[PDB]
């Protein structure tokens, strides 16, 4: 009956090698410069630049070869080396795949395999028919080999020949022409630049020579290099430092030239084709065009994310390609690729996947380097310790929630992600972003936070929901006071009501409630009211103190007003509360800690058995239908008939759910349809011979009363969230930022 199928895409693919910089971007703009090719983690998309829409899509799932092979793409080359819309994909393992865009995928691409002996392919580049491949071989520093690659027609094989070798490569960069390589080694350090296809350029010099003396007296941040860039002619080499100073060196005489605007570690440096301009980007959220004849500077500030990478992409420098990070989400690394028209510095093409904010970090996500160790950044020393700590947390520790709140729009079926201080509106039908709206105050885009400002925490959207009608948006926010202050421990809780017309795309804020339920009391649960009561313009808000507030929208005030309140001043605090409302709207089920209460809406008080004691704290209380109520406690789940008041079925969740998740996440893991039945989702660690980072997920369809299992399906990765679309199908989000669907 039911079946599972992936629907949306995932995060854009990046060259995630620590040593490689200036070349993290793998995407390529067509020779005709009419469309852009972007490889994703699970797909390859082709977007026509002129219309800024995805003209073509190529899924590895569709192609058997790509499905088996996909390992990540290390590079794309336009055309076919072996041989007008052909491309060659090089992956890290060494598979070379000749694929076609602008057409239909061929189920038998010219798959090949370059032979490497314990080498991880890092880069490939060409000038005119000649191809060299860079590979990684193994002090915590990886060494590199430069090989010559050619295709022999007789054997139809890619033969590899050795050119050069370098050891303990710290940092590396390739010229815009793709013909010069500059790198750093510890043989403290020395920088060497070499021509790739010729022997014309071969130079080396210690870092000490360019390195100044005052910085030598100063901390390591001043001596720490964060980025490097080499001019096409090789006459100029730019080195950026963690302190935020940029230094240009003339290779002919090693003369030094200081350009200092960035206050934090400069992350991306790139020379222009002629060499007269230098592009810089860093934590300031601002791209700087340094005019080198005069050291003037122009600014394109205000960008969404800090600049991981920056390049000039065009025969005449018509466009700039930039990589943005969105460090605010510490759980995941949120990459956004921007192509700007150099003429007017306007967004020619913005590309990103879904941007969920998980509760904790996942896999090997590490914060970018900064001048000091903060919540949103890692210091120079902090990187290794943080990586080890992350791995050992994923292995030894047992709390592995990695759960994200997601919301679905009844009127438009658009997917809402509560990003930190903002909401992403993402269309999974088209697999493209439709909007990004900032819904809170704070230093959110006013500037780029730098140094201690980076320790600031912007307001966090905790709970986001829609009314059943869908024209209203209820949002709950927590504002964190600044540290080192008397009022540094008094968190502020805010509630906001927003509206928009169907044609209009931006929500307009209609009312604001400051400190609902009192001061320092969080809004742990929110439930929109059913259609029967107040034709879907009411809502319920529930605390950890068991207090309930029913709000409705009054036409006379034109605003949202507190119709009913019940504030039993309980002294025990618990974040485990669940709320359900009957479809008729007569009654409300409120599970607080271990006890469930049936409260009559008219009196807004206990029914006149109203009290149901359970073994342990309730995580979720839900009614699949009016007759049956499904209640999940931390140890089990139980189906009760309200009609007879007895349990039908009981299922033990302890072996899987003991302390893996914080209370309240079962709400977003457990989903129900209003017609057919509900679903239970369980994620487990796969371990062979100590736990391993990779996970496995199981989704089970249950009928109303949980008598039978309609279906049982397995996914290969942590399904962060699952919810019921208003159609019979259910949508599920995976930590690969992948939205699949289970449905009839």
């Amino acid at each position: 009956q039911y079946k599972l199928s992936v629907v949306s895409g995932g995060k854009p693919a990046l060259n995630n090698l620590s040593s490689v910089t200036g070349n993290k971007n793998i995407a390529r703009l067509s020779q005709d410069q009419r469309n852009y090719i972007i490889p994703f983690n699970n797909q390859i998309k082709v977007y026509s630049v002129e219309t800024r829409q995805c003209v073509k899509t190529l899924k590895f799932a569709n192609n058997s070869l790509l499905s088996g092979i996909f390992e990540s793409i290390v590079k794309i080359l336009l055309g076919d080396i072996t041989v007008a819309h052909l491309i060659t994909v090089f992956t890290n393992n060494g598979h070379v795949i000749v694929l076609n865009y602008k057409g239909k995928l061929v189920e038998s691409p010219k798959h090949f395999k370059i032979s490497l002996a314990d080498e991880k392919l890092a880069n490939v580049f060409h000038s005119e028919g000649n191809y060299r491949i860079l590979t990684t071989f193994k002090n915590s520093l990886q060494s590199y080999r430069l090989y010559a690659l050619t295709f022999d027609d007789a054997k139809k094989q890619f033969e590899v020949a050795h050119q050069a070798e370098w050891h303990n490569v710290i940092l590396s960069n390739i010229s815009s022409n793709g013909k010069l390589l500059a790198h750093m080694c510890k043989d403290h350090k020395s920088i060497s630049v070499v021509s790739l296809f010729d022997d014309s350029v071969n130079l080396s010099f210690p870092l000490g020579s360019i390195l100044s003396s005052q910085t030598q007296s100063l901390s390591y941040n001043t001596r720490y290099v964060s980025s490097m860039a080499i001019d096409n002619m090789g006459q100029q080499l730019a080195v950026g430092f963690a302190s935020g100073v940029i230094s240009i060196v003339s290779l002919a005489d090693l003369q030094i030239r200081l350009l200092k605007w960035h206050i934090d570690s400069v992350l991306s440096l790139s020379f222009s084709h002629d060499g007269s301009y230098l592009l810089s980007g860093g934590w300031e959220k601002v791209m700087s065009l340094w005019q080198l004849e005069t050291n003037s500077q122009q600014f394109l500030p205000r960008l969404n994310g800090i600049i991981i990478d920056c390049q000039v992409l065009g025969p005449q420098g018509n466009y700039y390609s930039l990589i943005l990070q969105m460090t605010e989400n510490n759980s995941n690394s949120d990459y956004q690729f921007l192509l700007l028209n150099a003429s007017d510095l306007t967004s020619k093409l913005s590309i990103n996947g879904p941007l969920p904010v998980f509760n904790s970090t996942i896999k090997h996500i590490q914060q970018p380097i900064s001048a000091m160790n903060t919540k949103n950044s890692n210091s120079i020393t902090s990187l290794n310790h943080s990586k080890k700590k992350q791995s050992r947390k994923l292995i030894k520790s047992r709390r592995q929630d990695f759960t994200t709140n997601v919301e679905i729009n009844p009127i438009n079926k658009n997917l809402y992600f509560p990003h930190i201080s903002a909401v992403q509106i993402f269309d999974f039908y088209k697999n493209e972003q439709v909007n990004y709206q900032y819904l809170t105050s704070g230093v959110n885009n006013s500037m780029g936070k730098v140094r201690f400002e980076l320790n600031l925490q912007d307001p966090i959207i905790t709970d986001l929901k829609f009314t059943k009608d869908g024209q209203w948006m209820i949002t709950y926010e927590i504002e964190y006071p600044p540290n080192d202050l008397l009022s540094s421990k008094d968190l502020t809780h805010i509630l906001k009501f927003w509206t928009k017309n169907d044609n209009e795309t931006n929500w307009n804020l209609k009312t604001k409630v400051i400190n609902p339920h009192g001061i320092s009391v969080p809004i742990t649960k929110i439930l929109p009211s059913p259609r029967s009561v107040n034709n879907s313009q009411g809502c319920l808000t529930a605390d950890n103190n068991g207090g309930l507030k029913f709000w409705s929208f009054d036409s006379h005030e034109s605003n949202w007003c507190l119709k009913k309140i019940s504030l039993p001043n309980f002294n025990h605090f618990s974040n485990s509360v669940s709320l359900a409302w009957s479809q008729d709207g007569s009654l409300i089920f409120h599970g607080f800690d271990d006890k469930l209460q049936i409260l009559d809406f008219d009196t807004f008080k206990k029914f006149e058995v109203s009290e149901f004691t359970l073994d342990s704290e309730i995580q979720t209380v839900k009614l699949i239908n009016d007759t049956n109520l499904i209640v999940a406690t931390r140890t089990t789940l139980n189906a009760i008939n309200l009609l007879r008041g007895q349990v039908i079925n009981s299922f033990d969740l302890y072996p899987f759910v003991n302390g893996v998740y914080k209370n309240g996440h079962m709400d977003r893991l457990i989903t129900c349809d209003e017609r057919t039945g509900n679903i239970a989702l369980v994620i487990n660690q796969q371990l062979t011979d100590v736990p391993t980072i990779n996970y496995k997920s199981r989704i089970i369809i249950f009928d109303s009363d949980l008598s039978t299992k309609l279906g049982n399906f397995t996914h290969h990765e942590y399904i962060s969230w699952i919810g019921w679309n208003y159609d019979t199908d259910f949508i599920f989000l995976d930590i690969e930022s992948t939205l699949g669907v289970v449905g009839t």
């Binding site: 025990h572 007569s586 271990d594 029914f607 079925n649 009981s650 969740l653 302890y654 371990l687």
Partner: protein, 600 residues
């Protein structure tokens, strides 16, 4: 929802046809036009007696009577008010039966007798509808003939349904148009259902179907809001118009026990998805949508009660939840007397609120999966524990902990399988009988910590554990759902300081401020007075509790001499607390000429 006491409208005459109680309802007819929510009048045809119109409120009274010969049987009767050629008039149409030899259709017009007309009908007049707008009288006959006459009984139209022995016909109006559906038995439990629309022919056949498995002889039929309800062998079959397709079946257990032949069953619709079912002298108001018994009432003073008609509320459109129903009550005694009785019925709001816990329908942990991943017999044990000798603590504890593989003396999350209430309650019962006095097994300590400790044994539980301080202490801290009254009386009775503190925290934690105040008023003035003295001699919760006492005492009951002292005590505690605050916040926190001596 509720059912009132019936009140008498009239006493039925002692006629032989009415002597058979089981068929008595058949011999009494209720006019549909005059009986509704808003009408205060009922027109009733009592076979062999008369057709009589009564007013109900303020007091039942007979307003009109038309006598009928004793040998005549009323098969169909209707009364409707209208305008006739214009004068405001009341039209009464009734069919009478003489020995099956001749069949009489009669129409009477009265001024609000203006006229009386009588004709011979071909077959049994079963349903009569009066159309005051068009001045028409429509009579359905058992031979399948639907005949439309004027008020003068001049035959205007005749339609044949092509089926004889018609057994059920009901009129209804939808969207302003008149409709009638007719049921005709066929052989082998088959039934012809025909739905007809009243508008060259004024009668248009909309639907004709054959239903199988539909018996009549033991089947009770009623209609409401497009739904046909059939009670048969304790099962209510709900069919939906216009195709009369079986939509649902409800099993009604309380009728399944009835022996076939002795129990007198009557049945009507009273609102949307709500019916009234009378079994002998018992009356039930039932919600069919939610399968709940909204109300029940037993008429001890009558042998039987049979429904005749009920004024049906369209609760979806009506704010009124109040209506009436009429029936025949037969008394107990050697000379039973039958009377007409009316019952006032509150149907309710038609919400799920009404139906909870009123169902008329009467565990083991199941694995999630049937079959390389990290992991984070009740009766037998009851018998083993019961077989043990009296006052053997060691054997009891050994058997319990070993058989249930329990590792800790207190409840842990690992012990979920044990949480079945039935097993626990028996173990509690055994411990009480097995052990008495000053020695109890450790099994109780485990049971006290159990979240599903039965509510039934909560009462007097603290009283039982008074002798052991530890068991008493364990109950307060963890044992669930302790009654508040026992906690309060025990709070003011204990002199031990530590238990007083724990009890107050447990009381304040598990009970709202409003709830605790009311009980605490019941407490004697002396005990509270004693309690206040102890405070004179975590503490914030106790002080908060003291503040709660003062209000329950009330400004009047408070006596000046004591209040001065307590005023002194709190004042000393004020400066102690204020002094503490300052300490806490505290812990958080070149000359022109200089003379100096150098050192050499």
């Amino acid at each position: 929802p509720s059912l009132s006491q019936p009140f008498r409208l009239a006493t039925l005459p002692k006629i032989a046809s009415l002597s058979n109680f089981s068929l008595q309802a058949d011999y009494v007819q209720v006019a549909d036009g005059t009986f509704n929510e808003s009408t205060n009048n009922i027109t009733l045809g009592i076979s062999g007696s008369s057709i009589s119109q009564y007013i109900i409120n303020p007091t039942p009274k007979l307003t009109f009577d038309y006598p009928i010969p004793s040998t005549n049987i009323i098969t169909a009767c209707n009364a409707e008010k209208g305008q006739a050629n214009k004068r405001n008039v009341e039209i009464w149409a009734f069919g009478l039966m003489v020995n099956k030899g001749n069949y009489t259709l009669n129409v009477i017009t009265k001024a609000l007798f203006l006229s009386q007309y009588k004709i011979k009908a071909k077959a049994k007049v079963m349903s009569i509808k009066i159309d005051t707008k068009n001045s028409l009288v429509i009579a359905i006959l058992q031979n399948g003939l639907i005949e439309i006459f004027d008020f003068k009984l001049t035959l205007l139209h005749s339609f044949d349904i092509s089926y004889d022995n018609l057994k059920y016909a009901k009129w209804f109006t939808e969207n302003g148009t008149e409709y009638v559906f007719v049921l005709c038995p066929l052989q082998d439990d088959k039934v012809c259902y025909k739905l007809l629309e009243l508008t060259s022919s004024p009668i248009k056949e909309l639907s004709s179907t054959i239903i199988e498995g539909f018996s009549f002889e033991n089947s009770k039929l009623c209609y409401q809001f497009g739904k046909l309800y059939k009670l048969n062998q304790g099962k209510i079959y709900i069919y939906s118009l216009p195709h009369c397709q079986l939509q649902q079946v409800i099993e009604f257990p309380m009728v399944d026990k009835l022996s076939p032949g002795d129990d007198l069953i009557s049945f009507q619709p009273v609102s949307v998805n709500r019916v009234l079912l009378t079994v002998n002298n018992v009356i039930y108001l039932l919600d069919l949508l939610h399968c709940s018994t909204l109300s029940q009432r037993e008429l001890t003073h009558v042998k039987t009660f049979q429904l005749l008609k009920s004024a049906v509320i369209n609760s979806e459109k009506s704010h009124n939840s109040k209506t009436i129903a009429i029936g025949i009550s037969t008394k107990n005694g050697p000379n039973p007397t039958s009377s007409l009785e009316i019952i006032n019925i509150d149907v309710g709001t038609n919400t799920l609120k009404d139906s909870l816990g009123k169902s008329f329908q009467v565990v083991i942990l199941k694995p999630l999966f049937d079959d390389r991943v990290k992991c984070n017999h009740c009766n037998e044990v009851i018998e083993k524990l019961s077989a043990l000798q009296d006052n053997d603590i060691t054997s009891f504890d050994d058997i319990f902990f070993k058989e249930l593989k329990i590792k800790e003396e207190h409840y842990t999350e690992k012990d979920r399988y044990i949480s079945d209430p039935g097993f626990l309650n028996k173990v509690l019962d055994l411990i009480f009988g097995k052990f008495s006095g000053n020695d109890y097994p450790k099994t109780l300590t485990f049971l006290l910590t159990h979240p599903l400790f039965p509510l039934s044994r909560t009462r007097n539980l603290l009283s039982l554990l008074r002798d052991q301080p530890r068991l008493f202490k364990q109950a307060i801290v963890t044992c669930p759902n302790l009654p508040l009254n026992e906690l309060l009386e025990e709070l003011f009775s204990i002199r031990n300081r530590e238990l007083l503190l724990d009890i107050s925290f447990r009381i304040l934690q598990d009970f709202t401020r409003d709830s605790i105040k009311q009980e605490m008023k019941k407490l004697s003035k002396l005990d509270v007075q004693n309690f206040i003295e102890f405070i004179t001699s975590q503490s914030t919760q106790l002080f908060q509790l003291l503040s709660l006492v003062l209000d329950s005492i009330g400004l009047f009951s408070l006596e000046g001499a004591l209040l001065e002292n307590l005023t002194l005590y709190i004042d000393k505690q004020v400066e102690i607390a204020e002094r503490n605050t300052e300490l806490w916040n505290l812990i958080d926190t070149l000359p022109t000429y200089t003379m100096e001596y150098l050192d050499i």
